[model samples]
Target chain A: LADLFPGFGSEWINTSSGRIFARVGGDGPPLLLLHGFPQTHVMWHRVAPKLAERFKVIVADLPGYGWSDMPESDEQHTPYTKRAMAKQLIEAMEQLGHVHFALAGHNRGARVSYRLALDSPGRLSKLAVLDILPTYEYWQRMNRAYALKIYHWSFLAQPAPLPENLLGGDPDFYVKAKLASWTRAGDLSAFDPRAVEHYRIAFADPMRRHVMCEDYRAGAYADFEHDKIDVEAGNKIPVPMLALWGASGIAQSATPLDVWRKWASDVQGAPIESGHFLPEEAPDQTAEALVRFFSA
Target chain B: LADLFPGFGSEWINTSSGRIFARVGGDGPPLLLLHGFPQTHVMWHRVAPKLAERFKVIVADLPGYGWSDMPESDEQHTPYTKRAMAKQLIEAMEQLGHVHFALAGHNRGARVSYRLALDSPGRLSKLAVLDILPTYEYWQRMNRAYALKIYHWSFLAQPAPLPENLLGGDPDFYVKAKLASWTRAGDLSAFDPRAVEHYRIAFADPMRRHVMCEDYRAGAYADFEHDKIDVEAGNKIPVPMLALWGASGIAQSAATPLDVWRKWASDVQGAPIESGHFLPEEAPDQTAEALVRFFSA
Candidate 1:
């Protein structure tokens, strides 16, 4: 319990949606790091210190995840959409005195990161997304193989109380087992016990479980429809972007660099020698990629 | 408990796979009926007696479903594959003295029916598939909408103990709620209380739940690959086929059930039944009429 981010200061920054819990450390150009589903800022514990060496790192949990506030979701799940989550995070960044900042996000966080860069042009000097494709890309290309791997997108998005009830039966096992399978070695060896503990504790809460479902519900509806609009409008990510995916991650299902190129005005990326959780699985390589991309 | 299949005698016929529970009634040309998921031969209760008037109607549960024996499954889920299930049903029919019979199946049953018609030449006289497309087409044309409607295909196919564990938490709720959603009215009003009770009882059993998952696992892998091979070799269903889908059913996701079935069978004809996925229960009159006319012809 002694701090996954040792020497780092934790703060609960208030956003339009709710209070966002983030850990601020290091000192340089502001760098906001967002964490993914069923995880929190602790996910950045391994890679944050290294990235902080080059730039100030603020690792925050997306609302409705980890220690972040569980904002009330609507019919459209508007409160949990990447667009909405991106807005809340942007407000939190501005409150931290980083009106303009560099951003990096993983999994669900990567979704929010791209949404922010696309909608709030000129706010980010650079953006880095880890282990995912554009929302539009996923929905349009769903097949048996991809649908099998990401069944939770459909399962978790099911009308509340069903998935919540099932996962609630054994929240700890569901989270641990789900995380384990996504790892390259199909185990939790890459994950720190302390960091994973934080994940287990947060996911055990029924409210957080329902919120997690809302997050995915939004991904299926609001986020998918929003991305469709952008694709139709030819609206591209205005910021220079870095795409990093685990060599064996879900993002590799498509050509990462080529797909990123279609969404961002300036794009460059490579597959990290890791799994889905890049920061924990291959912190050094993930950190080095972020440093090189953001510094230039 | 007054018997859903009134005036019918029940039998646990032995097969190469396991014992198959079926209700046999009526008299004429042999007609074998197969039921869908989350239900049993009891699903044909509404339509069976009507068809019984014209034919020797035999309504049975697929092996590993309903009161049928739960056969041991393997990595390939070979025992639960449509081919394996079809072989068992064919064997059961042969024992019942119907070497050549007309077959009608709904949902998972339809999957088995078509597989049987394709693999066992000269086995089926005519085949009627209710509310589905070929296994290969489903996997190939899966999209967000289709996947949403039939999510259990992927969910149930997950390496067991996951889907089983989740469903086991509240088996009755899962089964009832699942059946309700697929009905045309989005409720269980069309289903009989006695029939629903039978479905609930069987689904509540953990072993049966695991077997159900194995059935879908076989579908996603073995059934899919077999259909793919048939498509590759142009091994169509040699028997004439009837394709019946509900107006608001999952099969409507395609252009038309007839159009899709044509790709796998040479002679295919059908019209939209006014119901949801459970055509036999929701529109028994129309369902029985179609089966009787087709089989009699």
Candidate 2:
């Protein structure tokens, strides 16, 4: 991954919030690229390099995920929340000299981006979330088939040590198998071998695996609580938001744009011809949507 | 269980649908007592004898459940549908010379009772479903909290062999452990040793496990579809229905007996009792009282 993106500076940037492992390069309007679960910032290799042409892209691993420093988990798992993680990314961007920027994130990172967009509405000119509906709304409508399809949401949310202990067994094989399931049509052939190793090596770390567990715990608890509060307050995203999902992926069970409309004032965009890993599975098309939305 | 209910006649009723093993005794108005998952007529062992004193109690193993014949599962799991299960029970009752009978069932049996009540509106004079709501309402409002508590509804609903193979290893361990978890206090002490052994012996058969899977598959598919059609058509039970649930049970996470039943029935009454999923096993006295009160009304 380092050799593939040599021009992009790969280093840790210390911010008021915490230290962030980031790859920053290119020259245009600044745009932050966030990656999803069971992967790292390396997940964007297929799309980030191209998006970097139109906008200076900053891609970073979620806090406590990938190469970033992992803080000890709390009872409430606040450190693992999008609220906490969102602030870190915003502060990191400010320290990196990109005061206000356009943003797009895939999966977990997209969740943080949405929280960040809401937390500091003025900071982001436009926001794009990839392949997920509002987290709380998703839970409110969760059913058996949907629950089984996205079993991890429940499995990972089990009161800590349970999932931590279970996932700790054969971490690599579990993550590999998990990643394979996350793809559309249930095939691993689409995953980049180098990118797969990046994920495998990180997941092999005990701390990384536990921190990822906290990430989901926070998602099930704080994230859902926060979203419900926002929804109750009639909170809506002030900025123009682009919602994209995989046409054939598990998310396609519903038209995401229809659901996104409830949470955002101005929501647009359609399915990319791909799976859950939008950037990796449909890199060029995902890049096209981001560039067009950001350029707008 | 036969020895426990000494005077009750133990026989298998052969119907147009299939043969169903049952226990029928006492005399008065006819009444059917249906048992839940992982157990057969033995589940009603505590409640039936008492009810038999007031009304002739018919306790039977739901088709694909206990000593009854297990049917082969299809893609839609048609043979295992509550509609199919309801038909066999209805036929069993008709063959037994009861033109109209009061009915009550627990767990899976309760589901079949609900379907029978809907499929044949005027047949059941009164109905009682212990520890459950309409299956359609349960699925329509399924959420994370509900999903976690009722995880088996999804796990067992998956295609056959998936759960069958998993449950096959140490069948006694799996069945006994599941029963314990399904209880409010999370202990198997509430279940009789002989009854637990009965469930263990049945679960040990791989064929039983497969049929159980099909029962759930039908729940997720055809049954949900049928219930939705009824919901759309405003079809409801005209017979007085009683909905009973465990206060600390998994079903309490949502609405209770009264609110849940109103969605499907014109007349319904219920009371929440302190127990778990296996209400008849856990609170037989309260369960029996609820049935006698509702049926007599």
Candidate 3:
């Protein structure tokens, strides 16, 4: 993973709540890049180095995933909630002296970016979310068809040990299968073998498996609650936000732009010709789109 | 399990599709009692024999549910669909010489009964659905709270062998755990040990487990489609109907029960019971009394 970024070095940013592991390099206006679930910051390996040429890129792992410390879950799974994740990202960016910078994220990171934009309005100058609808809108329009496409929303969100125990059985197989299915052409050729290996290794750990389940469990429960409260209060992302989801992937039912329009006044996005793993599946287009959107 | 009703002998009525396992030993007008998932006709161990005195109670298992033959699956899961189950039950009842009968079912059975009442109107005189609204309304009116409590609907509805394989791992534990969780006090004390044994013996079969998953797969896909078509056509149940659900269980989140039923039925009557999902097992007296009055009226 480190080899992909030639000039970047690793840094451990510690906070009172937990520790965040990130890699920083490039020199220009700061651009914070966060990765999604199953894979770590390595998801950006195909895109970040290119973005580095134009903007300072910091590829960071979300807490409780990759090399980061997974804090223990509480009764409501607050620690794993995207609210906490957004806070952790804010603190990590500030520690590296980018108090308010351009933000872009994929998959789970896109969700964290949404929470960050809403919960801490001024922290993101310009925001881009890849291959996901906002968590709030997704749940509101959820149904059998949509739920079928994303079965993990229910399976991993079950009450604790049920999902954890089921996942514990064949973690490696599960990791590779999700990567294959979520892509446009339905294969593993799009991902780097070493990164896939790293994913298999992390998933094999019981803590990683539990932490992943907590990430979803929080999404289905606490995150929905938090999003509901915010929505009811008429909260919307103040920053200029851009949305993106796969054209041939899990997002065919509703266009991301229409869904985003409901949540934010200054939102803009278009479907990239790729799958759910937009960054890895279509790296050049993803980087090009992000650079244009964030540097605006 | 048979000892629950001393005089009611076992009978397996053959249909064009499959065989239905049932116990018959009542008098007067025909009344059918259908069981839900993870359990079978044994659920009626408490309510049936008593209703037998007033009406000819036919306690039967939904196809693929108990000792009943699990019919083969098709591209649409047609055989296991409530349409087919409703047809099979209608055939089974007619085979028992019941051209007309009163129908009441709980949980998954409630869904089957709702479909039967709409699809075959003249065959049913009175219809009672326990602990569920019409299947059409459930999908249309779904929310996180209801979907969360009944997550199995999605999990079991996943494409065939995924759920089949996961469930095959510990089918017994899964059955008992579901029974325990969706109850008033969250335990198995409400269920008789012998009845629980009856349920365990049937679920131990791999084919039955697969059939169970297929039944739900059909509900999420084919069944919902059928309901929507009927609803869009404005077809409503003309027979008198009754609805019931537990206060501390699945019924809490659903809006006031009678109002939901009134949308689909010509006449609706019901109230909340102080129990859980397995209403017959949890509150037999209340359930039996409710049925006798509804069917009699």
Candidate 4:
């Protein structure tokens, strides 16, 4: 599937834990692109070419998703926490001979990008997080309306065995139902068939399903705990950051530009004027913005 | 004059109306550098190299001053009025193959840049104005101290023949006397020898002297008329802009940043550590602030 894009130059490398799928292309400075849940590195396929003119683009599929190896136990990887995932990706980039890079992420990938900026400040020159609120800010600010709209955050984070059981009842039904409910009609069309199948196959396994649920479960305790520690210690992502979101997304109104400004030293945001799936819906604008921000 | 910095690729082109002295170098986006009164494009030599790495820079001498051709009469060119000068520069840029560009100016150049952004809206993507007040605001809020510091605005605007004669008497003395009173000793060092000589030459001529006086005199009546028209027409520069001022300069305080934001669309400002009547002299910090702002935006 990765070979379809000749420019991507993808290579699969074996690690003790799993097989890491990574691709590198472009020229000039390096920009690492990360994808969110229910998607793979393929999410960036449409946007990569335009950005490649000025940036050395690197895109990767996370463990337990896409062509990467899935964990054998739920406890072994549990929802592939953003912090832990960032560390793994950083190690992968190091192995690939990249010392520094700019980063852009959407949804779950954005969560990891935030953690990367926080945990490894010197590794990134600039960071851009698309369509997501800081986890701590979201939990503290959530009202009834927000909870109802983004019901899955609470549902998935519930003690995981139940979530795994409920979701595993019918693998295909769960995948299709979740996809339909989570995205707008335009977003559904944007997803490639291969990418959609990858999500289904990865989540179909009971162990993988448990790990996904556990990841969310940990968010209730571990992710929030980490956020509290950083918030208390006055640790902020010091580099210039751009937070872009689709105007129609739940995350858009939830994390207002002003709120992000409070957390970032230098920040700017603009609505994509589309639906939640910004990369797919507004690829050109999204790519242009990322190029301008990181290059500047 | 062009031979001084051969590496700079400096060239002067003579148009039917006036001559334009230009220095072009570097790569990436084009940035137009404009200098204030009593200084030629040479004033930017100190700072232009620092910015040339990421931008193709072009600094031009304003007409009637520096090496540019002096018009026979200031009144003959209506557009050479501050607003007119901005339009002419933009047209010159179009002829030079620059459809869009970023602009930065100091003092008198700042006034011209402001008018450029206002008159030719889409031509400028970003604007940075240094150490000056919006003409309309300055006139509306004038006080005794304001009058004392900017006395030249009144003196130079005096009806034609008197100003021409007054300035003609020992022209170098008048120019040097004005320079000495306008800035502090420490600030004068920032003015290059070429700039001092350029102003000396501009003021020494009877025609250039009359134009210089008329340029200031226009502010007395013409500025008010333009300001009224701009306000009634609701003309506002829509692009992002940065305004910086020296803390000690004769212009309004750095607090004018907020005032400017109120009047203009998108704007930011910073206060420099130094102060004096001539900001570029007393406060290069203020002069250089626009770099931080325009880059960030």
Output candidate 1 Cα RMSD.
1.5
- Which regions of candidate 1 are displaced past 4 Å? none
C-alpha lDDT (0 to 100) for residue B135 of candidate 3:
66
Q: Provide a comma-separated list of chain B TM-scores, one per candidate.
A: 0.98, 0.96, 0.96, 0.87
Model 3 alpha-carbon drift over 4 Å, by segment: A1-8, A143-148, A172-174, A261-266, B1-4
The docking quality of candidate 1, as DockQ, is: 0.67
lDDT of each: 0.88, 0.82, 0.83, 0.68
Residue-wise lDDT of candidate 2 within B1-297, one digit each (tens)? 335576799889887667899888889999998887777788888888888888998889889778888766677888789999988888888888887999898888888999998898678989888888888888866787777667577767755544565465456766777798778777799988878878888888888888888888888889898888899999988888888888877556776657768878998887889888888888989988887778776
- lDDT for model 3: 0.83
Residue pair clashes in candidate 3 = none
The candidate 2 chain B region of ten consecutive residues with least summed lDDT is B160-169
> In candidate 1, what are the lDDT values of residues A147-171, reduced to their tens digit?
8878888787777767887887778
Candidate number that wins on TM-score, 1 or 2: 1
* Angstrom error at residue A60, model 2: 3.3
True contacts kept of 4: 0.00
Which TM-score does chain B of candidate 3 obtain? 0.96
Instruction: Grade the docking of candidate 1.
Output: medium
Model 1 pairs in collision: none
Assess every candidate by TM-score: 0.97, 0.78, 0.91, 0.47
Q: What would the per-residue lDDT of candidate 1 be over residues B91-175, giving only the tens digit for each residue?
A: 9998888999889999999999999998895998899999999888988877887676677889999987789888877788889
